[PDB]
Symmetry: C3
Subunit: 201 residues, 3 copies
Amino acid sequence: IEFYGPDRALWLGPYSEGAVPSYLTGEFPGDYGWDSAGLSADPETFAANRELELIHARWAMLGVVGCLTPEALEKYSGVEFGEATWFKAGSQIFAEGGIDYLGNPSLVHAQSILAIVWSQVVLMGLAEGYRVSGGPLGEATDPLYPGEAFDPFGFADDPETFSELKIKEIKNGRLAMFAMFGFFVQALQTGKGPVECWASH
Amino acid sequence: IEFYGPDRALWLGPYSEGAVPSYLTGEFPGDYGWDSAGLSADPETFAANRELELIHARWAMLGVVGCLTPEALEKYSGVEFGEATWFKAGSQIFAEGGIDYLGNPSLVHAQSILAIVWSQVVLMGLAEGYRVSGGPLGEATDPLYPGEAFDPFGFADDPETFSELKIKEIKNGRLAMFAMFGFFVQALQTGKGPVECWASH
Amino acid sequence: IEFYGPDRALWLGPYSEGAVPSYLTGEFPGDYGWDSAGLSADPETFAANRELELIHARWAMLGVVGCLTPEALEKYSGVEFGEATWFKAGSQIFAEGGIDYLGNPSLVHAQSILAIVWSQVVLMGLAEGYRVSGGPLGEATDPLYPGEAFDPFGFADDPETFSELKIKEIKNGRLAMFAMFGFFVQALQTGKGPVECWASH
Ligand code: CHL
Ligand code: CHL
Ligand code: CHL
Ligand SMILES: CC(=C/C=C/C(C)=C/C=C/C=C(C)/C=C/C=C(\C)C=C=C1C(C)(C)C[C@H](O)C[C@@]1(C)O)/C=C/[C@@]12O[C@]1(C)C[C@@H](O)CC2(C)C
Ligand SMILES: CC1=C[C@H](O)CC(C)(C)[C@H]1/C=C/C(C)=C/C=C/C(C)=C/C=C/C=C(C)/C=C/C=C(\CO)C(=O)CC1=C(C)C[C@@H](O)CC1(C)C
Ligand SMILES: CC1=C[C@H](O)CC(C)(C)[C@H]1/C=C/C(C)=C/C=C/C(C)=C/C=C/C=C(C)/C=C/C=C(\CO)C(=O)CC1=C(C)C[C@@H](O)CC1(C)C
Ligand SMILES: CC1=C[C@H](O)CC(C)(C)[C@H]1/C=C/C(C)=C/C=C/C(C)=C/C=C/C=C(C)/C=C/C=C(\CO)C(=O)CC1=C(C)C[C@@H](O)CC1(C)C
């Protein structure tokens, strides 16, 4: 169907005639007309919120995949991890033997949390500074879509395909954020991993 | 006294000369000049906040009445409920015998939480969709005051009486929201119902 | 260095070219170009946020000093307090003997929490009303800098020195807010006072 312009899909379905704010016109990906708290009435605040949403969504997709993969590997493939549960995997650094990637001592075999934290601080600070402005992989032509070195396979060369892929990215990312919130609440309530919860249901 | 225009009541009393933002001019009900975080400086955000406040206030009035009525009935009138305390009344669905209205098995006698949740989802979704736009009880001429089928006794026919009733509604609703927050904090801290807390004090 | 105008210090250092919003131009103290959520895009909301930040910062500086002083006095100077830890000092009013200033019964020797609360309500309400508008120590020339009776030593007479002192005040206040957040998190996690935590590390 349509995901742009005035004939797009809306968040309340057939009951969304009086639910769409005026400043939401279908210009940007993911516009379902859902701003009922008026948090994006300011155009600059709207742009900041769009960037925040896309960054949160990409992090959430990565987090869903990385929270599911080791638990599923332990359950089925037989790979042994110190703590394969996503909300317990941070405590392996304090257990004796450290964090062994895929359970193999010959791999990373990290033993100090301080070195991990400092390396992450330096590397992530540099990477985020590059994302905001400049960087050796190209400059920040777009805050969200700098597809020169970050689009090396050329999926975004066609503008219509680019718009469709933007819609797909925002939808998958919103689903991943919803799934991550579900993971957080399930971990808080039941104390079981998502794979184990799925198996027991 | 006066609750509209430039000579209205203000939230700091005689010390509110420098406390009223410029965009608050006494045009809408409940305007005491209290916006110190600047959350309603944008007119569209102000309208959204007004709608949110009125909806929260009506829900809070209903919640105060519904949280007080069963406990008071159990304490004095002698009516027997499974769990008459407001923050324990949700767990009656898991107790054997289910939820009996007024404690009578011949009444609702619900035992499945899933059916209750699904019926509530369908009915409340339809009702909220009607409230936002359209609906078989008239269309949404006003987001907050669609008084054609929802004002059948004609209390809002006189504009001056309508303004006074709007002021009364917003004030009672703010008081009910304050009372509901008090209920939440008292339940969290002491673990006793509002009626029992009142009796013991 | 420079803390005003377009050649000022910025929050991302050499990577802050694309990190500074347009509405942040170096006109106000503490402008490092850090508004990534777009919460201050509206100028009136920006002014409200500036007032909130400065008030929070002054309260945080006072809180750091007042949370460190009694614990350090007990540890080193030998002064005896009922509860010298900052997050336990509120419970001395319920212990027998009350709250003795510097541990001396001849001092305040308060016994009732209700009188303390009522006196604080009256005095702080009057003082905050004076701060917002009017007051017997001068009227509110500036929401944040009413330096007539509140600047009696005349440190703010020179405009350039006034700007430098504003920068120093906002920086020390932000550091104190960061320290107070650290105090809160350390108290929540370890249950030990900042002085004791410093000694054991
Ligand atoms: C389904 C998810 C998804 C979709 C549809 C898109 C879609 C898009 N992205 Mg986006 N992204 C997605 C996830 C993510 N993106 C990014 C990061 C970026 C960047 C930095 C850039 C884009 C760009 C683009 C565009 C180019 C076409 C493309 O990449 O097709 C997406 C193709 C697929 C989804 C095919 C399926 C691949 C999948 C099986 C890979 C699995 C990998 C593993 C999970 C491991 C990944 C580890 C990480 C660290 C690399 C298009 C709008 C570029 C752009 O806009 O250029 C103009 C651009 O510069 N994306 C992250 C964070 C790492 C994502 C994951 O969370
Ligand atoms: C003190 C409370 C209160 C007051 C003063 C008003 C005042 C007003 N409302 Mg509002 N409302 C109030 C509570 C509520 N209203 C609504 C929902 C609406 C709607 C949908 C509409 C109004 C409208 C109106 C206007 C017409 C006059 C009127 O209703 O007089 C209020 C009369 C009284 C308060 C008299 C006392 C009645 C009380 C004893 C009833 C008790 C009932 C039980 C608690 C059970 C209720 C169960 C629920 C589910 C129905 C006026 C501005 C109409 C409007 O603006 O038309 C232009 C309109 O369309 N109100 C809800 C949510 C259910 C409330 C409760 O929380
Ligand atoms: C390092 C902290 C700090 C700095 C640099 C400034 C700087 C400034 N303040 Mg600000 N303030 C500071 C903390 C605080 N101020 C205030 C409250 C005000 C007011 C109400 C006013 C100012 C004004 C001024 C200006 C005049 C110059 C001045 O006071 O020099 C600051 C000098 C120093 C920091 C020297 C060091 C003093 C220090 C050792 C004192 C320690 C005292 C104890 C902790 C006990 C304090 C108890 C409290 C209750 C009084 C300037 C912009 C005035 C203005 O803008 O006029 C135009 C004005 O009206 N400030 C509070 C809340 C109590 C603070 C503490 O948290
Ligand atoms: C989230 C995440 C982030 C990774 C960030 C990285 C890698 C940053 C690198 C960040 C790397 C950085 C900043 C590199 C920087 C290199 C630079 C500056 C090189 C250079 C130079 C110099 C020095 C010669 C100097 C010259 O003047 C300029 C220039 C340019 O010539 C990784 C997650 C996962 O790795 C886990 C944790 C577990 C896995 O199972 C799954 C995945 C997803 C792979
Ligand atoms: C729209 C709208 C309109 C109205 O007007 C107002 C409104 C209603 C407010 C508004 C609505 C707003 C809504 C719905 C907001 C909801 C937002 C949500 C749920 C965001 C969730 C974000 C979640 C994220 C980033 C998760 C990242 C996880 C990672 C990192 O990648 C790891 O898992 C990393 C990881 C892995 C992979 C392995 C583990 O072992 C260890 C760790 C480190 C945890
Ligand atoms: C103004 C202002 C200015 C500044 O500039 C910035 C600022 C300071 C931020 C700002 C101030 C903002 C303020 C003060 C905000 C405070 C808001 C509050 C407290 C809102 C409270 C809302 C409460 C509600 C909806 C309660 C509903 C309860 C129900 C549902 O009806 C039931 O009880 C239902 C129920 C019943 C009846 C029986 C039970 O058994 C079961 C359940 C289901 C629970
Ligand atoms: C910038 C920015 C940009 C982006 O775009 C968006 C963004 C990221 C959101 C945004 C960033 C925002 C940030 C970082 C916000 C953080 C704010 C913080 C940490 C504020 C902390 C405030 C702390 C205060 C007032 C503490 C007062 C303590 C007192 C009272 O004086 C006592 O201790 C009093 C006391 C004493 C002294 C003795 C004890 O015994 C008893 C008690 C009563 C406790």
